[PDB]
Amino acid sequence: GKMFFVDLSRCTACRGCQIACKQWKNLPAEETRNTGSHQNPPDLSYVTLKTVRFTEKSRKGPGIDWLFFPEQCRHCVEPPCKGQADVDLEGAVVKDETTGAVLFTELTAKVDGESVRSACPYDIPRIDPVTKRLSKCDMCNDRVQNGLLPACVKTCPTGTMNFGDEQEMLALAEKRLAEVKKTYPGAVLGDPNDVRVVYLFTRDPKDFYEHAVA
Amino acid sequence: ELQKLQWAKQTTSICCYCAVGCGLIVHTAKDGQGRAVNVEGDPDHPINEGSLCPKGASIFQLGENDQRGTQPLYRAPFSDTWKPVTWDFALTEIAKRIKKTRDASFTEKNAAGDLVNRTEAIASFGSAAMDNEECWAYGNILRSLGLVYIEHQARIXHSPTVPALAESFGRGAMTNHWNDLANSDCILIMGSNAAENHPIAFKWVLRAKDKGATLIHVDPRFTRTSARCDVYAPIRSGADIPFLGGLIKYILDNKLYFTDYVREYTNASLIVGEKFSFKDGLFSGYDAANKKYDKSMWAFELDANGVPKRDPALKHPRCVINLLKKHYERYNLDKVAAITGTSKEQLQQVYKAYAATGKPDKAGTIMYAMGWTQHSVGVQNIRAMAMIQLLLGNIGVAGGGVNALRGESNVQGSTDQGLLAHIWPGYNPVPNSKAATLELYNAATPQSKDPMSVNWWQNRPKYVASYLKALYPDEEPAAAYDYLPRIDAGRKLTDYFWLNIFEKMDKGEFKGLFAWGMNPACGGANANKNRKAMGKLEWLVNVNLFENETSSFWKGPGMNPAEIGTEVFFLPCCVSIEKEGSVANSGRWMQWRYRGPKPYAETKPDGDIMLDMFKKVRELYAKEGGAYPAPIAKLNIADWEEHNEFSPTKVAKLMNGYFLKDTEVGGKQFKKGQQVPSFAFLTADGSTCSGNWLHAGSFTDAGNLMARRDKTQTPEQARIGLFPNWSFCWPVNRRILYNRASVDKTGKPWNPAKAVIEWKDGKWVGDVVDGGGDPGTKHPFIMQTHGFGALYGPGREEGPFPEHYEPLECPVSKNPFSKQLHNPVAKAVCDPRYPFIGTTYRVTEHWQTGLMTRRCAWLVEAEPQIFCEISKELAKLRGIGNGDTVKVSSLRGALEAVAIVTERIRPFKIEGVDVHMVGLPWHYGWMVPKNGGDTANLLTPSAGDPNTGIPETKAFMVDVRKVWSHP
Numbered sequence A: 001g002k003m004f005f006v007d008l009s010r011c012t013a014c015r016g017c018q019i020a021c022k023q024w025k026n027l028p029a030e031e032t033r034n035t036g037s038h039q040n041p042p043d044l045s046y047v048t049l050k051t052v053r054f055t056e057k058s059r060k061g062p063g064i065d066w067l068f069f070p071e072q073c074r075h076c077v078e079p080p081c082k083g084q085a086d087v088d089l090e091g092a093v094v095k096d097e098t099t100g101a102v103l104f105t106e107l108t109a110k111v112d113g114e115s116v117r118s119a120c121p122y123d124i125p126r127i128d129p130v131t132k133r134l135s136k137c138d139m140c141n142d143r144v145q146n147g148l149l150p151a152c153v154k155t156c157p158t159g160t161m162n163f164g165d166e167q168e169m170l171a172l173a174e175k176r177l178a179e180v181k182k183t184y185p186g187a188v189l190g191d192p193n194d195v196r197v198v199y200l201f202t203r204d205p206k207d208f209y210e211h212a213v214a
Numbered sequence B: 001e002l003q004k005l006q007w008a009k010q011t012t013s014i015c016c017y018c019a020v021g022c023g024l025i026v027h028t029a030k031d032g033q034g035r036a037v038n039v040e041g042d043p044d045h046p047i048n049e050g051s052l053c054p055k056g057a058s059i060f061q062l063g064e065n066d067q068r069g070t071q072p073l074y075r076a077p078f079s080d081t082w083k084p085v086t087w088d089f090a091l092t093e094i095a096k097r098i099k100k101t102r103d104a105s106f107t108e109k110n111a112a113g114d115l116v117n118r119t120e121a122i123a124s125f126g127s128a129a130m131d132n133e134e135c136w137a138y139g140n141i142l143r144s145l146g147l148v149y150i151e152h153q154a155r156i157x158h159s160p161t162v163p164a165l166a167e168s169f170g171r172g173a174m175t176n177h178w179n180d181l182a183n184s185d186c187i188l189i190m191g192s193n194a195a196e197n198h199p200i201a202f203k204w205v206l207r208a209k210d211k212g213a214t215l216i217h218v219d220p221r222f223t224r225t226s227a228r229c230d231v232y233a234p235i236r237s238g239a240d241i242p243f244l245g246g247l248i249k250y251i252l253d254n255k256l257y258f259t260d261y262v263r264e265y266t267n268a269s270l271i272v273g274e275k276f277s278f279k280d281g282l283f284s285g286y287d288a289a290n291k292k293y294d295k296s297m298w299a300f301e302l303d304a305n306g307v308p309k310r311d312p313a314l315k316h317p318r319c320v321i322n323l324l325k326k327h328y329e330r331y332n333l334d335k336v337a338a339i340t341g342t343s344k345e346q347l348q349q350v351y352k353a354y355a356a357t358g359k360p361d362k363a364g365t366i367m368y369a370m371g372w373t374q375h376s377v378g379v380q381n382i383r384a385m386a387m388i389q390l391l392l393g394n395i396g397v398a399g400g401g402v403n404a405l406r407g408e409s410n411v412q413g414s415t416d417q418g419l420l421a422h423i424w425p426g427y428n429p430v431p432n433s434k435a436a437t438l439e440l441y442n443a444a445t446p447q448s449k450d451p452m453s454v455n456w457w458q459n460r461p462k463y464v465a466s467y468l469k470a471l472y473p474d475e476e477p478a479a480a481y482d483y484l485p486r487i488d489a490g491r492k493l494t495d496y497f498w499l500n501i502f503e504k505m506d507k508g509e510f511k512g513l514f515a516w517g518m519n520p521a522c523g524g525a526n527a528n529k530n531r532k533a534m535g536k537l538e539w540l541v542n543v544n545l546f547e548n549e550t551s552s553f554w555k556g557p558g559m560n561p562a563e564i565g566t567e568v569f570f571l572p573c574c575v576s577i578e579k580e581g582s583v584a585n586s587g588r589w590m591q592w593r594y595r596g597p598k599p600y601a602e603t604k605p606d607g608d609i610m611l612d613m614f615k616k617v618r619e620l621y622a623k624e625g626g627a628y629p630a631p632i633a634k635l636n637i638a639d640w641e642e643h644n645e646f647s648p649t650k651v652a653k654l655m656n657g658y659f660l661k662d663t664e665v666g667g668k669q670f671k672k673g674q675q676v677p678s679f680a681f682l683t684a685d686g687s688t689c690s691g692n693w694l695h696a697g698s699f700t701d702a703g704n705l706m707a708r709r710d711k712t713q714t715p716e717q718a719r720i721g722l723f724p725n726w727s728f729c730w731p732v733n734r735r736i737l738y739n740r741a742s743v744d745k746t747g748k749p750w751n752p753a754k755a756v757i758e759w760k761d762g763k764w765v766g767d768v769v770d771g772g773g774d775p776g777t778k779h780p781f782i783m784q785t786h787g788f789g790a791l792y793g794p795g796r797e798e799g800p801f802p803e804h805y806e807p808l809e810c811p812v813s814k815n816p817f818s819k820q821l822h823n824p825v826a827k828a829v830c831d832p833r834y835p836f837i838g839t840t841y842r843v844t845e846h847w848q849t850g851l852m853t854r855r856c857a858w859l860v861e862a863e864p865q866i867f868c869e870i871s872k873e874l875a876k877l878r879g880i881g882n883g884d885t886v887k888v889s890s891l892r893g894a895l896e897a898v899a900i901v902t903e904r905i906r907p908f909k910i911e912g913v914d915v916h917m918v919g920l921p922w923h924y925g926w927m928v929p930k931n932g933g934d935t936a937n938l939l940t941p942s943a944g945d946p947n948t949g950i951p952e953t954k955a956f957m958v959d960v961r962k963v964w965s966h967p
Ligand SMILES: Nc1nc2c(c(=O)[nH]1)N[C@H]1C(S)=C(S)[C@@H](COP(=O)(O)OP(=O)(O)OC[C@H]3O[C@@H](n4cnc5c(=O)[nH]c(N)nc54)[C@H](O)[C@@H]3O)O[C@H]1N2
Pocket: B018, B153, B157, B190, B191, B192, B193, B194, B196, B197, B198, B218, B219, B220, B221, B223, B235, B236, B237, B238, B239, B240, B368, B369, B370, B371, B372, B406, B407, B408, B839, B840, B841, B842, B843, B844, B845, B846, B847, B848, B849, B954
């Protein structure tokens, strides 16, 4: 299958990835306002599959530890969302056996929306008030199957976003974690044996977001 | 198959935002006959490799946008409503407005009786957003009409600093290029927020880090750039010269300068005359009454031939290097730490890390953009960077340079095309009234008797002749010379520039303004004054993508349309992906892009708008006559046209230039009609035309070199990423300027592992050599009169060495380096009701005044409203909570913003007092979106910098007060 390696030690929070996701799928913009943060949209929603979360942490000496987290579906090897959806209707949540993508179909409207979201340990699924369809990151599965990188990966200027076969990406993640640890001693990979979106966090993943890891 | 892209034609483009010059792929429905369906990164482009920041990434949303202008709008005097009109109508009435104002105002001769042939009743603003061919055509249309008040973006951010690089190296351009950053061993980012403002630059910056480079950010604020650097050093606003002066002292004291490089390639060895001195903060030749220097007191000691004398031993006490040592002894760590607010420990860390690049096998680069360099000593700030780079042997080398980051996608090109009052295309000066003949004009160019000094500007007569032969090919250059307008020799140069155009407008001295691809109602400092001032225009032509604060100033906040007599034409132009042409990026890469979809609705490329508008002025002069018609009627516009339309291809071939008859030049034969293969084969005798000598080599008989998409590289090219077969850069595809300085006198690289050029088998291999000649036979700075990198720069108004003069007027009373507090060559009120230092800056997601990005829902989504960034200390002082509405006020105006309370802003320690800085984005305007807010330029003074003629947008006094809501 396929895998993202997301090296958050390289992220400039440019939000190219946030825009690129909406442009490829032609998603609408939310109504947003500034509530004392650069972060916006403030959360994932039916029309927002990825938002970059900003957290400021004090450090001794000048400046801050500014933590950026471009949030997206982890495309879990064994997705709980599927297990929950399969209680109400099989075919609502499916697994692409070629890429490993976890995919919501139009039949998510026929399952319990709250239940499937509750089952996700990363709190990823979002419900349309109108149709009751569930939405999330689909790994740009169509692009991937046609040779192309996911939109958010291709757009990323810093080398934060990496995509490929799970063998080369796990190997990159382990090699890169060893190198990043020299500058950031508390650097860890996010649930690397359980997910296809493997984040390198520069410190306690929970500092980036409360649902950064399961 | 991907359904979205099925049946869509793929074309290439270049991002229409910042000067990185990222490649795009555009998909257009119906195999090109329809609308764009997709815009994303070009995976094959060597700069971005398919990456885009959110601005590039959202260009689909900019183009396929139902808020865009569809057709010309007309506003009649005192009207409170637009009236849709035809192109034929709007351009007819505009052509009658031009001629009417020109005929009434044209002056064949000034008060002193000198030939001038100009009109001072019309001004033009813009634009760095236009294609190079459209910039070159536009400037020449305005000048043929006799305008002298021709300005754009470049004046505000770039013009204040360019002279620092011209003085130092001989050219004003960014010395290296984006890919080259990956070869640097130490990257100093200072007066730049490149992660936000040149985002794809960080691909290459972080690649430098991957190969062991130290990344250093020196900034009053902690930004998205700071987050990804190894070292963040806070600096107090305006303390850059102390910081850099300390680094110079450190380099000199510790012998960390590259002696071999410094001895041969800088003016370190030149003997300064006895008349030079510095004491109590003043250079010799100071006229206290007129606050001005007699620069002849700074002259070099000259030998029998008029060549500056040299001590190659560097022992003579009046050697530049020994005077430099003496000047910078005062800049000790304690005083620099005290004024900068940077800890002594951090100063040492940065100094050690950066000065380590003095070693031949190490390269350091400095990235700066605008920062705070707009003030009177901004030029000296950059001078200091240039001097540090010359001491450490970092000029001409891979991973070195002064990377002066350009702002807009084509601000490099729009400057190159002479859309500033003082220059023609190719940096040939606009003649003044005393330059009464072409012979007199050419006499001004300085000569050198040094046999090793290339002094390439001696070729100027070939470029001026060829440029006059491009505009008027039936006339002898000397005759053509009289057609183009001249400025008053006696008048102060800044009287013709951006800020005095706003002063003249507010005095009612302008009948007509072209706001062509600019939003002055938001972009100009002191917006309340400028918005009023536009009311005093009789007419205004706005050429833009959207209705905006400029087009519609007459119905803005507190405006009564009934009282406002200005006649406004709004002419909607097409977005970048709807037209063909070139844009010159920060690295001088002149990149060809193609039409994706046809222009939206009835929008037009700028080239068609300007050409049709001119053609109508022409018709109207041929059938009525009027003021001096000769310049209009004889202007060669036939070379600008194909199939009844503006031809980017034909204009680009003219700007390159062609032979007007069979010619022997450089010992080779060239046929009539044939393309000039390089500016080296241009002539003064009218054998050649060329609209811009810098473009000679860009479009040859081999074809359009700007359109090359060839990644072919030799190993030595690929090792530093020159990509010489990808597009074309002026001059003659020299990717790294001053590259002769990268080798010793045998032509061997200082750093072979990062060679730029190398002498092999009687040839320079690698980059194109910046100046022909065997190794050790030429001085490496070929555009300098004397041929050296200038550590000592006697052409600078404030002195030949940078000196700390306090740019922060209000909170500072003491200068620790001399008795001279403020710039002795340069009226702030400092009202106590406004105790905070207001500053304006950018975020990644918005572009300029936000006219473009406030129309893109995904960018508004991310950054929906004007905000005010403040420290916890100022928050605690003014009782402001995060997310509270605040009122920000100055003597010039007031606005509301959302408070962002952050440790990313800290108080400055100034003379035992906490001084608070308040940050605002200038990306907002009353037009759009709803609850976006207005321009931060309501707050800023128009009170201009005496020297540069640019106002203060980086340090202006404000107050911040909580706006109370209901409990
Ligand atoms: N996203 C985005 N990118 C842009 C633009 C845009 O609007 N949006 N505009 C483009 C244009 S036209 C231009 S000219 C460039 C300008 O590019 P920059 O010069 O990078 O732009 P700013 O953010 O205005 O200022 C840069 C930094 O200078 C710092 N600074 C302020 N005062 C001082 C001082 O006294 N000393 C030092 N050392 N630093 C100081 C500010 O805190 C800020 O972080 O950006 C270009 N790129």
